[PDB]
Beta-1,4-endoglucanase (Clostridium josui), 193 residues
Amino acid sequence: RAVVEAPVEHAPIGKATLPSTFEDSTRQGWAWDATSGVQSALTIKDANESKAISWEVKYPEVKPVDGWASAPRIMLGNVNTTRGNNKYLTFDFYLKPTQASKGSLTISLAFAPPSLGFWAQATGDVNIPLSSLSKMKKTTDGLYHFQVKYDLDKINDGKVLTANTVLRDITIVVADGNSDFAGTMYLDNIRFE
Ligand SMILES: OC[C@H]1O[C@@H](O[C@H]2[C@H](O)[C@@H](O)[C@H](O)O[C@@H]2CO)[C@H](O)[C@@H](O)[C@@H]1O
Ligand SMILES: [Ca+2]
């Protein structure tokens, strides 16, 4: 299936680049998956004094049965990278809510390794409760700054990412955990470490 809307003015696509820093004012190869429930503009905005890819999302009040249906699902296609000697994949993730009071966001990471059926999903989904935010200190530009980490030795389905396993795509999903989130999201510094 494909989720479609009228042409949207994304920032230039650029070329797949890791670490993804967005400092060339392009998306450095990131784009929505054709199945992403969010297809609005991906632009390069400043977040916490660095350029970051960004989009807007307000999840539906009526929650879909399928937990990824309404989710931003962003992908770095055809990067053909490998983890090397890195234990983690990590990135800066920022929120600028106009509404956030209940439920949570559940952030998942996956890859598409041609040797592993084109899908390998990190086990360690990260949940951000929206009631936690009001007590969290914001950045000077009014964002909530998370550095999210995924242990690449914890993968579903007994699949193993070796140092040399080719990862053709990287996918990040920000799913709605029964939340009332509305606002802006940003990613920066997407890298293995
Ligand atoms: O439908 C949500 C569900 O998706 C699962 O991943 C799928 C993905 O949606 C599809 O694009 C891809 O081709 O295959 C994978 C694996 O079947 C995901 O594993 C679930 O955690 C998620 O709830
Ligand atoms: Ca940056």
Notes: The chain has no helices and eleven strands. Residues 106 and 131 are 14 Å apart (CA to CA).
